[model samples]
Target: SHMKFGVNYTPSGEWFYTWLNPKWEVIRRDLAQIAELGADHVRIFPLWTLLQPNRTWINPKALADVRRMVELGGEAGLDVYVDVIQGHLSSFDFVPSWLVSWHEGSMFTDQSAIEAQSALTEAIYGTLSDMKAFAGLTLGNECNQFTDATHPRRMPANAEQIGEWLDTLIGLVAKRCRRDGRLIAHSENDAIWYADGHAFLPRYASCKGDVTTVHSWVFNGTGQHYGPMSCESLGHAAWLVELSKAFAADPHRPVWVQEIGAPGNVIDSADAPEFCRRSIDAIADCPDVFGVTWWCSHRIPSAFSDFPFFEHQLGLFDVDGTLTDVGKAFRDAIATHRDTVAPPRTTAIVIPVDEQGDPLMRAAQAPGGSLFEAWANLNRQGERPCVITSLDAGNPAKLANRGIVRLERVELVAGHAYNAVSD
Candidate 1:
């Protein structure tokens, strides 16, 4: 069966000054909604600053709310995935003014700033950090930032320091929640967190969690701050597959593409579906990947809408609670291949043709043929579903010519079933 699909609920509650008010009732409804969709999990973010407003004291009410939220999720027959945000805290006024002020200076160099930061950290670790009490505190929200080129904004800890802190954090949280041991995970950005020298993998090792998760928005290049998504950006998706293979090769853990989706605006682009399809396909091909969690369950108006910033429409459902075309595509993909490990196949093919009756080509073509080739070969073979072994070895031209080819030797487990042919 296809792995469980879930949504990342940001809990933009009254306290956090976001649309998603952190009310247990609201959360419960969300859980119930997820269940209705046949989804068994929902990722919840208990904002670090909201739960722990100051250094000296922990907010009992907030903690209780979270505990209840988890209970409700259990009652709703949904697995709750909590956000650890080990990377950085949201800069909200709800936190002590001192912590907010510290942001003005260098967070890394300022001792006073670190102390202020620790105060908030302690609050998050205070209640749930005690594993014996809240065994459900498994998935850690280690959200990093893009500002910290070496280390993003949200992720305050350096790569070297993140492991130890995470280790301690995990151990503490594990102790509190014993019987139903939780799996700790961090939803980190792709290029910023896991690329060549990023600290995400090591941090996962340090935390000793069951899976390594990543967030991807590779194609949505809009906000001047975030950049635009383009066909050229496809490399990012390719790199992630390779990285997943490398991480899965590690005997100690499994990898997950926890959060992945394109911005709604990208739908306006002519290549939107192709782009979205490729991203999903890449995640599916990675051998060690357990599964992917779409970014959200609800969609808001576009940023360009009259009420700009009113919503982050990343969900499968539109404002009217109906599934959009993209949503249908996602659902159909999941449904068609739910019983199989590989993704769905493509029914059409389009190759760029030059004016001279030749296919337009790049000097360095992707090892696999076009996006269609990948879908055709990877999904039809029925090879044992596993992490993609070697994305770098397969020849796209050869695979395209052969129609359905099984490069099983390159996979982690020999003689595994992979559907590598297109219908």
Candidate 2:
């Protein structure tokens, strides 16, 4: 009931390509398992190139696969959010030759000559070359030069051009689909292409969809480099919130965190339980955050063997299907709140003061005994009473008769509010 929690289950490693491969049984089982965990939805990627590999033809087999996956999801009582690669295609090397060709020449040129090409030409040249024909292609690869550098991948220049294409594609897809679904186009953070007044935003604004989605990898540090968790990394959630708010303002759409997760190695800490608890709390506290799908449920074990991308220990389920402690924490948080133990009641007031020990905003009460034990009781009970914080000695004396006494600097505040009673 705490919002629709879900996971992005990448079946067979190639989410987009495998959709039409008739591998329903494998993914259906995965969906069943996800349902067992109490998740209400699952996001699956339908790679653009895989679905429509060329201009003249569409992959019937792939389309059938997508429909089957959807049916399976519905059967499991799970809402399916299809991952539209409007921003770009997958990095898999098996890209169609036409797409590769589109990347080589006209796709990056300023001249209109490159824009007037055939389906095969446009696929190889890049989708932007001719918006009329190739506008349906997902624009994901525009900003990342590491994969394809020749084209106008980054923005302000490509912003408007890319936005128009995305708008058209979203409209087309929405019209053709039978069941209601949402659409989101991933964009580069630096481009600000979809921000507003920019081309992409208007296109998205014109479309009818439930929400906007964005992928964020704090562990990878944007595109600059990789590093440990910092305030900036944690703060990245705020930026996504801002983007979601911006998009929502147009269509008043909900914001879905299509992707957000730390690499297993980077996130695996002796203090992992606390880290996860705090992180989930942070997201839960954020406004306009409708849902979040962890980046992946599993990956090829050898995928990150070298640099150990995010420390390779990211899977919640081990190779043998056993849940790690962190995985257990994630499952508990998602499946139920029974495992979440709260902190204890006030024992002594510790007024955190400046270096001179002068009291600041207000004083805080410290638990008398073990923090965990106190928390366990509070969690079990669901709440705890706030300690009194007044400076009057007469009032303290009067309260003392009622078993209430000033411990250290703890005092009762007149007319001040408190929990009154613990749950």
Candidate 3:
């Protein structure tokens, strides 16, 4: 299994509008820049609305733009993975007009929307199947939002109905790819979310996902990481391995760390890609992980500052299109990855995440109070500490590939935690 680095491809300026109309120069320049950075692939979003404005309308221009993107990718010598739905990300609804009328939840609960989704999926992938630059296809981008105060017909994303919904769509993508056999993944197919507690992984990976893929961000108190800590925290890497355990797709599916971003939060401005470089260093030897794509290739244009302007600084490329310190760091990480196998880790303390997906914070939470204290004490004395990724847990066996899980009431002490072993 060969692993290569890639990034989420987005517009530097004139963001969403670029999809409504096709243009070549900016995107052409962007693709050329991505190649120059030594990245091999890009994940492209179709913004659901631009593809299907209504149940009956499929925009030809959007499809044509996709075709043009494939052509451009060929020209730039890169692999392009086109996402069919934009429902969950990029700060845009991208939801078609008609569906938004009923608060949107009702459609997914019924067959009409499901059929429309599959049809459009086939429409996209089937058309791009022959493209030399179409490396793979994805169904959606973290599009799995289910039941909150938002939907009138509240449904759980892990609900059987939701599973059926994802199953149908993933099957469509899987079937199309079977013929071409390029590559595939569900970008945010992870079954759970931060505060959502115990959402079951939708089983889409086994439902013919072809590849076990997931995304994780090093943001604090969210994702698999309990809270943001030192840039050296093993949280991100730990979470990646736990994702592998949850799916375990018969040891057949290759786990793709499809999207992982570690932002440099320091000195009032993030100039170092240190976190990104170290993240690769931590995960390089994980047997289950096969590929990784950074969250972005370019910084979000300053115009889109409302989406937490500070985070917009994490791109490998600057807005003016030059590799900042981090971009070069990323390239270096890629080179180092070629000859390396991660060495075994040594854990001083392990705070394993319980089934509820919460970090068993510092000792004092319950019957396991003493165990927590013991690890906390060890944590103070740590040279290299053992870390447990936050995940639906209770199983020490899941961590076997990385380290030995030694349990103590709330937090366990893992010896030689593979993730804990860092450069």
Candidate 4:
């Protein structure tokens, strides 16, 4: 398969809170439709607050429901990656009551909270490790947002603190859940990669995990800046794959398009079919991008009428399990690209890093910086360009591995006067 096509499986009803009192039939029915969509797997959210309501305990029933989810997915011919924490989903932040009481410090910095989180990770892994359908664990749903100012219970944390927190969780999963053929990845919103001053930097989000996960939302200003149907808007996901690969230490590290969607608010519903098609086609030949899971599977029903209108409509299927136009487009897209073989990258852009100095380097990583301008320019010239960091630019074998036959240095004006090497 070119990209492992799947859905971020939102249960048909009650959202993730269904774990509290699951109706297995509903899940089974939903998975069947997802399978019909030609999906290879599903990424599920297990509400953190529901599963671990207290620091000292993890709900047994919730664990059982999670295992059942894996079994159901297997029966429906789908692999399942269960998210350990639903830190943020839609527009809400889910916090365990115990963590709320600790007004002294936040989960990322507090030792007690870290221990509790570790315990949760172990418990979930133990429950699913034996299942044939269990793909692996995703650290959380944009958990890094906990440290962002927009979070209702946001806590102040420095970049190093955020890095350490990710290190701890990534290490635990690698050690405790280290099994062959199982994946371990940590996910974050575009802020971690594109925002200039966000506490969670792209390096922390990409460098340590088994795979670099990219979550692109046009709401992050992609559509607003470039116009929704522009080539830039259509190719954002492919651009993110190249951007994330540049920061990873391993040249072969895979990038998963974990979350990408057309928001009704930003992209008119009438244009979603084309948005879905062109976006998938844009990334069809990106090397090492192994999977593409739509932001969601099922639309939120009217029962949860409080959600933003876009949140209610981002799914492949409607509340009644009927395929939406977006879902049809997604199915058609996957069918069209299922056997795509990526050609060797012919063009490369060398992006250098200077953490100790060069204050402008970080800004360039965000929107409208030299890096994006260069990337957009390459796209307009009909080239699918990959990226190489300055550290690896001197190695020819490594460049060949990425299919690079030519290198173009971009003049970055984010900081001091400097010239990048090119040939």
Q: TM-score rank, highest first?
A: 4, 3, 1, 2
Per-residue C-alpha lDDT of model 1 across residues 6-117, encoded as one tens digit per residue: 5654432232233224556755665666566666676665654555555445567766666666677777787766664332322221223334545444333346544544
lDDT of each: 0.44, 0.41, 0.59, 0.80
Cα lDDT of candidate 1 equals 0.44
lDDT of 2 by residue, 1-423 (tens): 134567666563434345546567767766776666666777665555565565356566655555567678777777765543422422232333444445432222333322222232223222222212111222333222312222233222354455444444444444423232333343443222112222233224223344555554444322122123443344344334432332232323445565555554444466455444445554554444556666455443444333344434554544444555655666666755323332322332222233322223311111111221222233235333222223322344534432333233433222111111100
Q: lDDT by residue for model 3 over 218-334, one digit each (tens)? A: 433221232244432433553444334433424334667777766444212353466667667666755545577877777877876566554677677788888877788878877
lDDT of 4 by residue, 261-361 (tens): 98887799999999999998888868788788997899888888667878899989898888999999999998998988777677888787655222246
Best by TM-score: 4
Off by over 4 Å in 4: 101-104, 176-178, 355-360, 395-397, 413-423
Model 2: lDDT of residue 222: 24
Give me the displacement of residue 411 in model 2, in angstroms. Answer: 41
Q: Which stretches of candidate 2 lie over 4 Å from their true place?
A: 12-22, 86-94, 102-157, 173-210, 220-231, 243-252, 269-274, 303-312, 335-423
lDDT of model 4, residue 84: 92
Per-residue lDDT for 331 in model 3?
81
Candidate 2: C-alpha RMSD after superposition: 15.3
